[PDB]
Design an enzyme around this catalytic site. Structure first.
Site, PDB file in Angstrom:
ATOM      1  N   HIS A 149      45.821  29.592  27.529  1.00 12.24           N
ATOM      2  CA  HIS A 149      46.497  30.038  28.742  1.00 12.24           C
ATOM      3  C   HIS A 149      47.109  28.894  29.554  1.00 12.24           C
ATOM      4  CE1 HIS A 149      43.433  29.261  31.897  1.00 12.24           C
ATOM      5  NE2 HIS A 149      42.535  29.935  31.218  1.00 12.24           N
ATOM      6  N   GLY A 202      40.582  25.448  38.262  1.00 16.67           N
ATOM      7  CA  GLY A 202      40.711  24.140  37.632  1.00 16.67           C
ATOM      8  C   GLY A 202      39.595  23.836  36.629  1.00 16.67           C
ATOM      9  N   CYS A 259      38.756  25.676  34.014  1.00 18.08           N
ATOM     10  CA  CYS A 259      39.005  26.174  32.664  1.00 18.08           C
ATOM     11  C   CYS A 259      39.027  25.021  31.670  1.00 18.08           C
ATOM     12  CB  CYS A 259      40.297  26.972  32.559  1.00 18.08           C
ATOM     13  SG  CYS A 259      40.299  28.443  33.609  1.00 18.08           S
TER      14      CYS A 259
HETATM   15  C1  LIG Z   1      43.394  31.965  35.077  1.00 17.32           C
HETATM   16  N1  LIG Z   1      42.300  32.898  35.324  1.00 17.32           N
HETATM   17  C2  LIG Z   1      41.066  32.552  35.746  1.00 17.32           C
HETATM   18  O1  LIG Z   1      40.192  33.391  36.009  1.00 17.32           O
HETATM   19  C3  LIG Z   1      40.836  31.049  35.936  1.00 17.32           C
HETATM   20  N2  LIG Z   1      39.526  30.763  36.478  1.00 17.32           N
HETATM   21  N3  LIG Z   1      38.458  30.564  35.660  1.00 17.32           N
HETATM   22  N4  LIG Z   1      37.382  30.399  36.397  1.00 17.32           N
HETATM   23  C4  LIG Z   1      37.761  30.478  37.726  1.00 17.32           C
HETATM   24  C5  LIG Z   1      37.014  30.457  38.898  1.00 17.32           C
HETATM   25  C6  LIG Z   1      37.659  30.688  40.107  1.00 17.32           C
HETATM   26  C7  LIG Z   1      39.040  30.903  40.154  1.00 17.32           C
HETATM   27  C8  LIG Z   1      39.804  30.899  38.989  1.00 17.32           C
HETATM   28  C9  LIG Z   1      39.135  30.703  37.786  1.00 17.32           C
HETATM   29  C10 LIG Z   1      42.576  34.301  34.985  1.00 17.32           C
HETATM   30  C11 LIG Z   1      43.320  34.994  36.141  1.00 17.32           C
HETATM   31  N5  LIG Z   1      42.935  36.222  36.441  1.00 17.32           N
HETATM   32  O2  LIG Z   1      44.246  34.415  36.716  1.00 17.32           O
HETATM   33  C12 LIG Z   1      43.343  34.358  33.670  1.00 17.32           C
HETATM   34  C13 LIG Z   1      44.670  34.780  33.586  1.00 17.32           C
HETATM   35  C14 LIG Z   1      45.336  34.783  32.365  1.00 17.32           C
HETATM   36  C15 LIG Z   1      44.695  34.348  31.218  1.00 17.32           C
HETATM   37  C16 LIG Z   1      43.390  33.932  31.336  1.00 17.32           C
HETATM   38  F1  LIG Z   1      42.713  33.574  30.218  1.00 17.32           F
HETATM   39  C17 LIG Z   1      42.706  33.915  32.520  1.00 17.32           C
END
Ligand SMILES: CN(C(=O)Cn1nnc2ccccc21)[C@@H](C(N)=O)c1cccc(F)c1
Ligand SMILES: CN(C(=O)Cn1nnc2ccccc21)[C@@H](C(N)=O)c1cccc(F)c1
Ligand code: NA
Lengths: 301, 302
Positions: free
Chosen positions: A41, A143, A145
């Protein structure tokens, strides 16, 4: 004596953490030999995230579109490929701090350490379990991830988790290091929800065995149970079924303490019925389910 | 989201752990620059441990009586001296993995990470607080002595604890890296006991702030209180007094969440008085006191 949620020493993993940038997105990658592993992603823009076509997004990228930073040093990307939900970036330097390692896919109930990282720099380490509903109850900010989970039994690091997302209930979802998600989750911003979670029965029992080893017997009773009657009661409190495999696995702890597994099961039934009546077990007022049979033997006398 | 008991990454400390052997005793040492630090009790046999004269036991030892192993390499000891309750073994090579570091003494209530080690080999890391009674609730087996506690404050490791002993209640006692004990303990086999412990009030409040940040709000209420009234309550429940300095320290969290410290004290008063009524806070049925205000800000903000 004592009993703590104990993580593996993180240094072998710290030496592998890098920062991966694509466009305006920065996250963490894992640098082993001459490959950097990270969530695919990273290649998504604001638009993409609902229904990304990763193959289409990736074909449009060149090696030099990926910026990889290891401490103060830029690595040169000389190849890329996607495997399931991870990006593998081939770089022109093998990591000189690469430990002995392997990739293992874990089952629900297993524990591991997480090294939480931001901008390729480690922030903290804590112990997690893979929940029955295939989420983890981590501690992660934006951040994070690409942060990874691991065990180090021996001097060999077993990588078992890579962080991809936070679900709406505030729990966490990710992949093994081959990029296969744990659970039914997908790397898209669609509404998806973790199933109802359950308590990891075999781990609670393991931890009751730890309490006995450490000198506490107050919660035992004179009774036993059949496996089937145990499961009929335990499932009424949202506990996972206990299987014969689980009974077999607890055999060493049974032998060390002199308490039969189904006798310990009887103790657990009574605890669910009575609660603790103002007492604690290993300093907890709740029944702990994030220590495995193996973790108890590792930590306890 | 989420809130975990979290230790500092341990790699900078892992590179400094060695095995120290003297006679039949093997324990852990800390190798910084060209000195190895370890508990002075390494020089004792069981009988000696009853009434050791450390100065007298040490004068009888040669450099080569101390076997120091860093991984698979033996280091050569070229000197030995004592500072308080720690032995300092001068070796012929500076540790090339020496991090930027200081020795600091911590206060009761402050937290730190412990790298538990056996035979100079790090085995686990966990987060501890120095209890008001100067013990730590660690997790240690035989062979763990010389395991160390630390904070990291930038690229600088602040070493604050070295493990010396387990007390009869199963809690732990040790020194700073200058060999001064935390608490009224001595390094010998005699009757020793931890004093009655208290709860670290400022930390419980910090953790309630963490709960609110993470969406757990059921315990908030419309009331506030005063320092003096609250302190009458804390004392009754074997909580440490809350000072103005404590209130000042929690000021950021107060501002972020819109809950004044004495407003949160009113929440805490009610919890102490009424219990939790079946509910949990951040997955706990007891009030957690091993996160500092700084720990909460560090984990919740970056
Ligand atoms: C990017 N995403 C996160 O949750 C990223 N993250 N991880 N731990 C997180 C903890 C707090 C906030 C964000 C966090 C999501 C999203 N909903 O946007 C997402 C969107 C598209 C593809 C993805 F595989 C993941
Ligand atoms: C060596 N001692 C430990 O407690 C060592 N230890 N630490 N954590 C321990 C946990 C489990 C077992 C032993 C443990 C004792 C003792 N009884 O001999 C002692 C002797 C001499 C000087 C001392 F400051 C303490
Ligand atoms: Na209030």
């Amino acid at each position: 004596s004592g009993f703590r949620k104990m993580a593996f020493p993180s240094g072998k993993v710290e030496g592998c953490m890098v920062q991966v940038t694509c466009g305006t997105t920065t996250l963490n990658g894992l640098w082993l030999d001459d490959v950097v592993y990270c969530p695919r992603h990273v290649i998504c823009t604001s638009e993409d995230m609902l229904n990304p076509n990763y193959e289409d997004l990736l074909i449009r990228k060149s090696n030099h579109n990926f910026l990889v930073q290891a401490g103060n040093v830029q690595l040169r990307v000389i190849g890329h490929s996607m495997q399931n939900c991870v990006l593998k970036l081939k770089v022109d330097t093998a990591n000189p701090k690469t430990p002995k390692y392997k990739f293992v896919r874990i089952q629900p109930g297993q524990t591991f350490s997480v090294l939480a990282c931001y901008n390729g720099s480690p922030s903290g380490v804590y112990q997690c379990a893979m929940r029955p509903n295939f989420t983890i109850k981590g501690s992660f900010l934006n951040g994070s991830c690409g942060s990874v989970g691991f065990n180090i039994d021996y001097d060999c690091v077993s990588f078992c988790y890579m962080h991809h997302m936070e679900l709406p209930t505030g729990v966490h979802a990710g992949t093994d290091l081959e990029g296969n998600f744990y659970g039914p989750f997908v790397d898209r911003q669609t509404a998806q929800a973790a199933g109802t979670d359950t308590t990891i029965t075999v781990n609670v029992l393991a931890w009751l065995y730890a309490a006995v080893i450490n000198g506490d017997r107050w919660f035992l009773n004179r009774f036993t149970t059949t496996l089937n009657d145990f499961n009929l009661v335990a499932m009424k409190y949202n506990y996972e079924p206990l299987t014969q495999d689980h009974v077999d696995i607890l055999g060493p702890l049974s032998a060390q303490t002199g308490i039969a597994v189904l006798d310990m099961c009887a103790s657990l039934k009574e605890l669910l019925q009575n609660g603790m009546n103002g007492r604690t077990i290993l300093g907890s007022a709740l029944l702990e389910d994030e220590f495995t049979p193996f973790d108890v033997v590792r930590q306890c006398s």
